[PDB]
Design a protein around this ligand. Structure first.
Ligand SMILES: Nc1ncnc2c1ncn2[C@@H]1O[C@H](C[C@@H](N)CC[C@H](N)C(=O)O)[C@@H](O)[C@H]1O
Length: 248
């Protein structure tokens, strides 16, 4: 579809809205002092607006503008353009929308202590590693996808913290361990296969916070973790998602 952009507010353009609808507009939106009228394709209109075809980037921008802060006690996840006047610890992330990220942030605040060394396995946007530094920990975020590293680095900087970010997985992290705590938002079968190496990555008394787990698959993780010598400490869920916390 195409947009016809006009300078002005809906209130000011009121006189010509009927004409835009007669001309076939199916949608209208006031967007920062401009009225955008949406059509299947350009048609002849006397209003002196400008036609432009709508693309995926326009959809992304519109969606972005509709984003609001997301609470994840003790944190609040904010888009770089959000302002927040609450008590919550801010976590600025270039567009924390998932249940699992939320479970992970709340669990992290409980199990992480100032001065703890943290491994955020499958760091992605770097949100967990960033929250760990904000809580007084020292974190390493690793991801097998090199492409996420630059955005993670940039989110860190926006948050005034500096975790270490590295391409790779668990084996790549070992030289920097052992760690006091590992947080891994992955999926149940992967946790199950890594259980033995999770034990190796942590110091005695260390903690493993596992999420990205569907309720129907929780059994797999309980079994592999018990099998690996971990003791369960806490469980929490949101929707169909579960976080399981263990001590080594
Ligand atoms: N085996 C693996 N080792 C390291 N990273 C992985 C592995 N498998 C998947 N990943 C990354 O794990 C991340 C999973 C994300 N859902 C987690 C992002 C972030 N930690 C969060 O809680 O929101 C993705 O960025 C994957 O690229």
């Amino acid at each position: 579809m195409w947009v016809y952009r006009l300078k002005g507010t809906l209130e000011a353009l009121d006189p010509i809205l009927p004409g835009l609808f007669d001309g076939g507009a199916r949608g209208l939106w006031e967007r920062e002092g401009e009225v955008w009228a949406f059509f299947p394709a350009p048609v002849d209109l006397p209003y002196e607006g400008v036609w432009e075809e709508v693309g995926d980037e326009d959809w992304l921008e519109a969606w972005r503008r509709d984003l609001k802060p997301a609470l994840a006690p003790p944190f609040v996840v904010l888009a770089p353009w959000h302002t927040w006047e609450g008590a919550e610890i801010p976590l600025v992330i270039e567009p924390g929308h998932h249940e699992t990220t939320r479970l992970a942030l709340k669990a992290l605040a409980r199990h992480l202590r100032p001065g703890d060394k943290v491994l955020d396995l499958g760091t992605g946007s770097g949100v967990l590693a960033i929250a760990a530094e904000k809580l007084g920990g020292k974190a390493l975020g690793v991801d097998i996808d090199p492409m996420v590293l630059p955005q993670a680095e940039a989110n860190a900087k926006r948050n005034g913290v500096r975790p270490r970010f590295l391409e790779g997985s668990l084996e790549a992290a070992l030289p920097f361990g052992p760690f006091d705590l590992l947080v891994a938002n992955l999926y149940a079968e992967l946790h199950a296969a890594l259980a033995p190496r999770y034990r190796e990555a942590l110091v005695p008394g260390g903690r493993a916070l596992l999420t990205g787990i569907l309720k129907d698959r929780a059994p797999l993780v309980r079994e592999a973790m018990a099998g690996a010598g971990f003791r369960p400490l806490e469980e929490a869920a949101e929707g169909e998602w579960v976080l399981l916390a263990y001590g080594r």
